[PDB]
């Protein structure tokens, strides 16, 4: 949906729920290539649901 698209495009943008420090982790993982940030975003966006 919109949030999955946001995670694929700007992984920090989709993940604004979690924490003040987790968002830096997602952002810097996005800085390293682009796959680590997306992976973190999907992992912590499927963790509150699954």
């Amino acid at each position: 949906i919109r949030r999955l698209i946001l995670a694929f495009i700007l992984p920090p943008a989709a993940v604004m729920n979690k924490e003040a420090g987790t968002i830096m982790l997602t952002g810097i993982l996005t800085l390293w290539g682009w796959i680590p940030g997306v992976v973190a975003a999907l992992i912590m966006i499927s963790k509150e649901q699954s």
Binding site: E19, A20, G21, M24, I28, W32
Partner: protein, 667 residues
């Protein structure tokens, strides 16, 4: 009387002190004093730019031999050739014109800098009186210029810094438009949107003039809110802008590195390899021990060459000495180290302001996100811990890769270069940002990440633990000086916990990740410590990894190769000696020895007093002062950092020596 001594070592004590290197501290400065200081320093900057332009003269059009080449002007000569103010011309006729242009620009810079310095002096003294009209301007409420100062900024000069961003952006739009018109009129270079010539610079100057003017209008009518930087803009806004300028400066170094190697920059940088450079202090024409002058022809003691009479500086080609990338690396590393230093200093000064607001309770009184984030004492711990874990992972992985590469080179434990990480290249989706992508570039990326995170550890410790830390929260302690070096050997020792010492540790940690740039931009194969060495297999990298270039030498063998030219010249040799001298003296003040120095200085004082009586006469009341651990750490950080980067310069300025001929395997 044992008390007259006591208020002598109760003079350098790291309580709250004058600290001469804080006379221009922003606490005692107002907004207008900052404006005046910046204007005076920009005038001095124009003065030194004029001095550099003078140093760029080679013919002195009135008629005389000119200046020898120097790095101060060689780092800007490509730009002046780009602007048409200097030439890569082989003939005196076209070089007299370049000398005249440089002399005129130096005089213009002298005049403009004098005007700017005078204006900054009057701002510094709160004396905005116009001597021609006799009136006085109001810093708080001034018309900017006139009718232009009314159609935009309809009176009502900015009263706050967030309200000053917009008029500043309009001022920078005026700067962009002025530079564009200077190009178009004085320097030819009509604005053509052809992004392969200097004309594109004028075109983009007009484009950025329009962009900055519109953005300044918007921020004048819609000022943004960082909120907290408005109050203590002396340290809050200043430090935020300092770290922003640091990141901008690192970015500018990267832009310079990429651009100066492009074909569009060839007539300005790559063409430096077709020139011959006569640098100050380089090997000069030597003569025997019995030279008796009498010029025209040497009689006794023939010199090295019959040409270059007496003690002339010998020519050096721009192709063997890679002056193109030598100048490129000098500029790029200057801006990169300046950006790293500005980031560190911004974090440190922000920590200074932040401790100041933690001490008076204003820390809990901040509403902006940028502090309401870190006012948690757990998100601080989580952030620092995850930064430390990422630094540990990256640094351990990359260092073990480097050590395994070196082992496979030297064949320690009977290994082989085919057991090395020669296959570990950047992904093909990442191979576009490197030329000849190999394990060297992978190691460079991971070393940059590891060093950046390593320094980020101390930067985060400055940002968060300015006043208290979870350790010092658990203990009954708090930090309240930003410059105190310790509380003592209690708890086994409390050395270097203040944000000043954390700044020093950040600088020392970034030394590695920053010198890793010097190795890289010189092509020095940081993927292993012994490359190009003929020990077992270090010369097989070019074949096992199918390299296209041939980098200088490994991390350790980099001090053997390309030091053949540092030693070959007197100036670089004496710079090497001075840098090493300055560097190891930092041990006298970083080693936990300040009290030993104080005790020994007391002994020396008693000796000099006694030696001034047994042999001399009269009172010898003078006593030796010892730098306290706050001063000792400041001076030591300066000595260490300068000592290492006076010689990183030597690596950069001694030549490139990164030939494009991969040598064959030893077989």
């Amino acid at each position: 009387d044992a008390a007259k001594m006591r208020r002598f070592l109760f003079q350098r004590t790291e309580t709250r002190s004058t600290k001469w290197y804080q006379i221009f501290d922003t606490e005692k400065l107002d907004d207008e004093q900052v404006v005046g200081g910046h204007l005076a320093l920009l005038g001095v900057l124009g003065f030194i730019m004029g001095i550099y332009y003078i140093s760029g003269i080679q013919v002195f059009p009135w008629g005389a031999p000119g200046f020898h080449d120097n790095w101060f002007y060689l780092t800007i000569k490509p730009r002046m050739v780009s602007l048409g103010i200097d030439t890569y011309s082989t003939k005196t006729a076209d070089l007299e014109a370049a000398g005249a242009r440089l002399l005129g620009w130096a005089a213009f810079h002298f005049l403009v800098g004098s005007v700017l310095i005078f204006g900054g002096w009057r701002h510094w003294t709160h004396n905005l009186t116009n001597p021609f009209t006799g009136r006085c301007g109001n810093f708080r409420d001034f018309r900017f210029l006139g009718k232009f100062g009314d159609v935009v900024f309809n009176g009502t000069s900015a009263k706050s810094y967030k309200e000053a961003l917009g008029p500043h952006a309009v001022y920078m739009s005026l700067l962009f438009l002025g530079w564009g018109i200077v190009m178009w009129a004085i320097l030819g270079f009509a604005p053509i949107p052809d992004f392969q010539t200097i004309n594109s610079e004028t075109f983009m100057s007009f484009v950025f003039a329009v962009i900055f003017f519109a953005l300044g209008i918007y921020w004048w009518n819609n000022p943004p809110n960082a909120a907290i930087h408005l109050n203590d803009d002396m340290k809050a806004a200043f430090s935020v802008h300092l770290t922003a300028i640091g990141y901008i400066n690192i970015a500018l170094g990267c832009i310079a590195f990429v651009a100066f190697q492009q074909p569009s920059f060839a007539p300005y940088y790559k063409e430096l390899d077709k020139l011959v450079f006569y640098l100050y202090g380089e090997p000069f024409n030597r003569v025997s021990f019995n030279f008796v002058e009498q010029g025209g022809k040497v009689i006794s003691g023939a010199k090295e060459f019959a040409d270059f009479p007496a003690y002339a500086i010998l020519p050096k080609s721009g192709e063997a000495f890679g002056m193109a990338r030598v100048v490129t690396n000098l500029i790029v590393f200057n801006h990169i180290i300046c950006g790293v230093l500005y980031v560190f200093a911004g974090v440190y000064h922000g920590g200074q302001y932040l401790l100041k607001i933690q001490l008076n309770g204003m820390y809990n009184q901040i509403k902006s996100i940028w502090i309401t984030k870190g006012r948690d004492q757990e998100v601080q711990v989580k952030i620092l811990g995850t930064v430390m874990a990422l630094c540990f992972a990256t640094m351990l992985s990359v260092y073990a890769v480097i050590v395994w590469n070196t082992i496979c080179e030297l064949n320690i434990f009977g290994t082989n270069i085919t057991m090395s990480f020669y296959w570990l290249k950047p992904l093909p989706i990442f191979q576009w940002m490197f030329a000849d992508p190999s394990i060297n570039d992978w190691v460079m990326a991971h070393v940059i990440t590891a060093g950046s995170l390593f320094s980020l550890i101390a930067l985060v410790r400055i940002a968060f633990f300015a006043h208290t830390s979870p350790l010092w929260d658990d203990l009954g302690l708090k930090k309240n000086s930003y410059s105190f070096p310790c509380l003592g050997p209690v708890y086994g020792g409390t050395c270097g916990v203040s944000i000043q010492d954390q700044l020093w540790f950040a600088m020392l940690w970034g030394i590695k990740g920053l010198s890793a740039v010097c190795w890289y931009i010189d092509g020095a194969w940081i993927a292993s410590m012994m490359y190009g060495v003929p020990a077992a297999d270090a010369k097989a990298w070019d074949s096992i990894a199918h390299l296209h270039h041939h980098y200088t030498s490994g991390i350790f063998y980099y001090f053997w190769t390309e030091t053949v030219t540092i030693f070959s010249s007197s100036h670089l040799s004496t710079i090497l000696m001075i840098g090493h001298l300055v560097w190891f003296i930092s041990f006298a003040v970083w080693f936990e020895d300040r009290g030993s120095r104080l005790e020994g200085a007391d002994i020396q004082t008693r000796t000099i007093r006694w030696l001034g009586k047994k042999f001399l006469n009269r009172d010898v009341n003078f006593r030796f002062p010892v730098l306290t651990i706050s001063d000792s750490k400041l001076a030591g950080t300066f000595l260490y950092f300068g000592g290492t980067f006076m010689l990183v310069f030597l690596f950069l300025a001694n030549g490139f020596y990164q030939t494009n001929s991969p040598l064959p395997p030893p077989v």
